[PDB]
């Protein structure tokens, strides 16, 4: 028969999450319970009633007696593994119970940008069987797989935890068990309304101050500073993301903040060049539908964004 | 009986304190003593009276023998354990003392950044048992844990350093001891009143200095430069700090000075928007009301953020 | 004669391609398929059918038989090999399975920056055998072989997926055989529009709005404005490429770029010292002329590139 | 008796001083030189005169024969200590040569920035003797320990090297023996005086020459621009700096310069202020005696710079 | 007799030349015949004829009929030496062919920055034996040493390529074998010419245009602005050097254009001084002159530079 084995994952400290190599680094710590009816001693009292091996003499120990293993392979696994603590107690019934204290980093590959920052992430762990569902079987422990007390991160918050089995048939042509470890995550936005949000609205409050100063060259020096500032916020953004392929939304916002500007210093060398040529009325009439429209252009923008986005 | 078993730990050099990640990375010295009657041996004289013995071939003699053996877990690893020396004195009595030089990361949740820089911080070490109470009991040594002559920082200073024991469970149902070296740590201001707090000081003086000018454009170009100052500092506070989920008391100040200035850029702006209109008079009773009102609206910032984050 | 040997590999997920130091870090998975006749062994039922072992305990037992074993050597490799799983079973008819998970780094000498970034590129990961084609040869496995589903990446997208055995004569004298799998890869268009090509349109176009200011100083700063603006860019660029040392197609862009503004700088400089002689004429017929030929000069730009590069 | 120990080590090449983590890497060599009569074989002509072995192998016989060895533990370590060659010969006579050919890296506490650049360092690497003196000690080889022909490094000059023995208390009650190799340092003046220096002198002159303009607003502005540049100057010096607890040299030349360029700012908008006045005069007079004081005013800083900090 | 030990060492891909460390990282081959008679067996048709073994089940053998073995120490290895493969052939005439692929970085002492970047430097590695020449002595493999087909690298090119023995007396007193593989390198100049030459050229070429501006304030403007142009590059040379203690050629060509920058600004502050003081001719006839020196102060800087260092 396929012999049950059961398993237990948790992911004791989350270290990181390395949004731009699109991966995150845990210490997590594993518990396989494994009941072999051969591994079963003939033990006397005063004796223990249960074993205690490290790793390596346990393999060769199994290796002398020439019994199967399950074979726990990491399929998200990323980098080395670091593995910190290997033990495995051995009980007069026959049952193995293996510890492995460990931390390592996971890829996962369902970053959606498509609402960043606002968009919800979900990480997974993968615990997968090199050998086939035909030789073993993976439950899962009771009590003991999820999340804990403190995990000592600020930019994301934990929403839902989640733990199943599945079959896969990648290693093997027969069907193998992978044990998945799922959680959602959120962020938080106090730092992106902080030190982004309200720097952009100042700046662009100040640009469309800038419009009704009149003798246009202080408007187009002014506006030429906003450019700058917006490019070093642009360069800012750049550096925080990945290479994403699919334009995000703080990309579109900050590319069409971009061209608005650019249009309001192509408005103001215009309305210089009217008044070079010196129809004054032009360009006094043409002020007011500008500065009216300026303001109710970022607000159709912003609707378009929430419309389109959402 | 459930056998005592005693601990020292001693940090000898805090190698470093990473924020931006929320860990710190030290070197550790770990000391167990371990009294189990089953390890004596029969001496003759002559022969050595305490054996010596290195990690491997003695957890393979405790294999042979059949005996369990306290199982260290660090509970706050963090990254890979460094392994430097790793030797066991066996003595006559059957008393084993584990020497294990060390070098490693690890983390600490308790950052609490609302009271930054000033605030003081809690690190601490923890020194778990795999195994639960009823086998195994943590003591404690009496004159060798706690920390060293020269630590080797300069940015942080330790002001108190305690040692106890307590109760968890975590890995096993039942209870298990954990060895806690636990140490507050402060911070020097020196750094952040050097190359911070005074050029703050010397660009908004210059900011104030600036009102009285007249011909309000160099008003208005001078408060753009120093927009640009202070959102390069805002910038150069950013990377100092990890990606902080509630608002900060530095951050508080950066993100005030930038509404304070762009109201200045906005309040010399309609000044000239005043005079574009000719009432010189408003203007010119405005302007002294503005100046004697900025510093005194500085001096009320200092005052309210005294008050609530205190 | 020759055993011959079957050979599947990879690439489950490629965690990186770092163009700056022309190498990609990818985790891959390996397998070896070798029936050798001598290690068949006798079995009873009741016995395992298929024995497992780990790759020490393998190793000296083939040292103990007196055995040859296939030397897969990597020849890309870079930096450090890092081994996750290694496993064996071990058939009745004398075929051993060998399972080697793995992530490692490798270098692609085949990067052509000719055509960044359009330029398609060819990755592609080698298996040499250390022994000569003499004692053993490589097969390739019928349908394991290739790519996963789920790579991972968002900057690069797989094209064409090839595999195939080759022979070399770098270890020793003799042949000896080399399975390549090769993948061919392209890259996503979507940032360097986004964030790269419209604002040097942008800037390029208000430089261009700049040329009819009249009164020739505020084309002379808006032009230094647009020298800060594109040297930056130069160093954005800069930075993201490696030291290449054959002009590529962006480099050649920006700093064709460059020498047009800095013409532009010259041209208005030119036109202000011909207004100090007082020709107001010479300039009021020469500025319809640059006006005009400007974005023609960046069309015909456009169309030599084209032209010189494809 | 406490048998005699010998030990000789040296820093062949010093990979790095890494200021800012206060810490530098080495690659090192030890020797240890230990007669202990127990080893001592027989043999025979044509046996080799003296055996060589690795440490593994070395280490499982002395746990044979049950001998104590020393424990070289290294104070100093930092990060991983990385073994690359460990050979020891064994002669006749019963003397093991061990070689330990390897490369770490150090902390060095004693930084003291009082004088930076100008201040000379103080490195040191300590080897103490786990096992205490009253069953071990450590004498000094005769002319093997110091530094070598060629170290690789061009920013530090190493002025002095020594070696000496001392005595400690720290892991044990007992007194242990620390073969200490301690070597001061010095600092290349070449860069600062090159790409610091003179940039600054040129600002500051500048900044000097923009003093009698007249038409004070383009005073203003450079002096603007100098602020700029000085604190770009700051940026720089901060990244090259430790988080240092007290004030340096440099770091109180930049804030003294912050202060004397901020107060040259309000000078003139002091002198603009009174202009507005009309009062000429007052500001012609004034003007003299600035401009006599403000050079007047650097060497007065320069000489109580040089009193102070010498 | 001295057993004659034969090398053969092959960098087959140069992964990194970092220069600001002063090392530079490659993936090697090494090869070793050592004839040991001892080793020799006697074997049957049938069996192998050359046996294979991994590294430490051969030395645990050698261990066990105790031989010495040549022990190949890396005297320019830097951080920590990875092994790859470690092989070897054992032959019935007595012969070990020992293969050894890896990867590390080694130190190059030699590098001369008198003539960056045109300079040509000098990497070498270095195989010392640890036991002296009296017992074992290093020969050179026929065709096998040198390097590959494929470097993998861009910005360095191999000139020329050599190998030899040498002895050197460090780690015993008597003499002992090095064996080194010393190849020159190159630097591809089409970088520094693309994106550091030609912007400085266009810089200094538009300061010389701002000469003839009249109306003495554009040109100081502009000339702060090259100011800050020349910084920002001084600052991007300043991070691709090391520390460096002689003052280089690009390093003395940046500090004189900041010198001459500098006096420009000076001298038109100068010019507008005298303005003041109304003496327009005095200005007319020394701007001539000024003109007519600029370029050629900057062919007599470079002039003195050709001849000064070459």
Known sequence: ????????????????????????????????????????????????????????TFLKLLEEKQIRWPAFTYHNQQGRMDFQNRLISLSEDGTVMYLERFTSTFQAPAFDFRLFPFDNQLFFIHVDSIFP???????????????????GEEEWIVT??????????????????????????????????????????????????????????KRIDLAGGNLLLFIAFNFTISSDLPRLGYITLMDAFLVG???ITALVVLGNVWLRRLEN?????????????????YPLAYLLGALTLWLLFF
């Open 160 to 217: 839902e935890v989640n733990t199943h089995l599945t079959t896969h048939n990648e290693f093997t042509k027969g069907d193998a068990s992978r044990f998945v470890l799922e959680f959602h995550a959120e962020r938080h936005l106090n730092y992106y309304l902080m030190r982004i949000l309200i720097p952009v609205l100042l700046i662009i409050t100040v640009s469309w101050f800038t419009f009704f100063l009149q003798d246009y060259t």
């Open 277 to 293: 040529h010196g129809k004054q009325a032009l360009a006094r009439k043409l002020d007011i539908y500008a500065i009216t429209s």
């Open 133 to 151: 569902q035909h030789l073993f079987r993976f439950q899962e422990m009771q009590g003991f797989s999820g999340l804990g007390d403190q995990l």
């Open 1 to 56: 028969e396929p012999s049950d084995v059961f398993i237990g994952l948790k992911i004791d400290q989350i270290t990181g999450i390395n949004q731009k190599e699109e991966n995150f680094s845990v210490v997590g710590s594993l518990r396989i319970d494994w009941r072999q009816p051969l591994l079963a001693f003939e033990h006397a009292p005063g004796e223990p009633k249960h074993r205690t091996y490290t790793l390596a």
């Open 257 to 259: 903040t971009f061209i």
